[PDB]
């Protein structure tokens, strides 16, 4: 199967530049988007940009104001993210991910920990922020888009210190291996993910993501934990 | 009529749920300077359907003629009853990857010096006649990737299902 392997954790001084590598093996390198997403400790997911390697030009979130350079070496099937002018707030796990012809990021690197040490955008609103529930109960998660995204909405599950796992894409399509107690619904601006009956493996943080248009945008997440 | 529908959006995988690493990927059948993707047998329903059949047209020399055969609905009973092709105005209109989705593009705006003959063997150069052709130019400066869809994955004959055909035309720089 497809494997994304990223370069190791790094400690960087303020003002330095870091260049993270993402080696792709299995499937096809040149014609599929390689995507960069970061997560500051205890915070949400933030899309940084993407490259389709044959194009020899990445696309970037305006937020990063040219601090981000995304490149690919087609001869080694390796993608790169460089972030310059590093500061405290850039301390994060940097994820590379790829699409596999279904538009969504469905294959993920392990992430690269980087510790820094001495306008038209679609807003996704996720609720509730937290859910504490017991085994066998029903969990519902809501995600509103600020503009129509048709059915271009994905749901990810994330366990502590692990890459996001795709559960649902095109609003209602289960990823291979996802159990039937998961279902997604909605179109336009209002979306829901439902877990009919909670199992121990279901406790996690969940994120919706629109992939209608760049920049890709995430809800702030729902932390679904066991009732005390 | 040549007009692009800016709203049209799809994906290589369509509704098959197959990721590109499980596509059956193969090279076009190349005889002199004619590169052929024939979907007549590849898309017939089988017990193992639906599969994605990805025909790779890899071009790094001049004046290559690309020919794509997509079997017509009813050409053989049962086998192609739910077949579809995208774009409808192939080969004047093609699909390119914009962000992570396929959207329509005028091929002549993508590639300078493209030959499309209005007719193939006295018939309209259009999938409604079962076959399209075009000839790429003597020089190409920038790597260019575009797609056609010949999708039989919704044809079901009891426990046999058709396959989704993709054409990926991957044009490297050449002519120097």
Residue numbers in the entry:
A (entry chain H): 1 to 118, 142 to 251
B (entry chain A): 557 to 732
From the paper:
We solved the crystal structure of Pfs230D1 in complex with a single chain variable fragment (scFv) derived from mAb LMIV230-01 at 2.0 Å resolution. The structure of Pfs230D1 is composed of a mix of beta strands organized in a five-on-four sandwich. However, four cysteines in Pfs230D1 are paired (C593–C611, C626–C706) in contrast to the other 6-cys domains that have six cysteines as three disulfide bridges. In addition, the Pfs230D1 antigen contains a long N-terminal extension (residues 557–579) beyond the 6-Cys domain core that packs against the 6-Cys core. All six complementarity-determining regions (CDRs) of the antibody contact Pfs230D1, forming an extensive buried surface area of the epitope (1047 Å2) on Pfs230D1 that is primarily contributed by the heavy chain (750 Å2) and less by the light chain (297 Å2). The discontinuous conformational epitope on Pfs230D1 comprises contact sites on five beta strands and the N-terminal loop that is unique to Pfs230D1. The antigen–antibody complex predominantly stabilized by hydrophobic interactions is mediated by E565, T566, T567, E568, G570, D571, A573, V574, S575, D577, Y579, K581, K610, E612, T656, K698, A699, T700, V701, Y703, E724, and Y726 in Pfs230D1. Five residues in Pfs230D1 (S569, E576, K653, E655, and K657) form hydrogen bonds or salt bridges with the antibody. The conformational transmission-blocking epitope contains a major segment of the Pfs230D1-specific N-terminal region and this contributes to the specificity of LMIV230-01 towards domain 1 of Pfs230. Only A699T resulted in increased affinity, which can be explained by the threonine replacement creating additional hydrophobic contacts upon modeling the change into the structure. These results indicate that LMIV230-01 should bind >99% of known Pfs230 variants suggesting a broadly conserved epitope.
Pfs230 is a leading TBV candidate present on the surface of P. falciparum gametocytes and gametes that mediates binding of exflagellating microgametes to red blood cells. Here, we characterize B cell receptor responses among Malian adults vaccinated against the first domain of the cysteine-rich 230 kDa gamete surface protein Pfs230, a key protein in sexual stage development of P. falciparum parasites. LMIV230-01 forms a distinct group (Group 1) and has potent transmission-reducing activity. Pfs230 antibody activity depends on complement fixation to lyse P. falciparum.
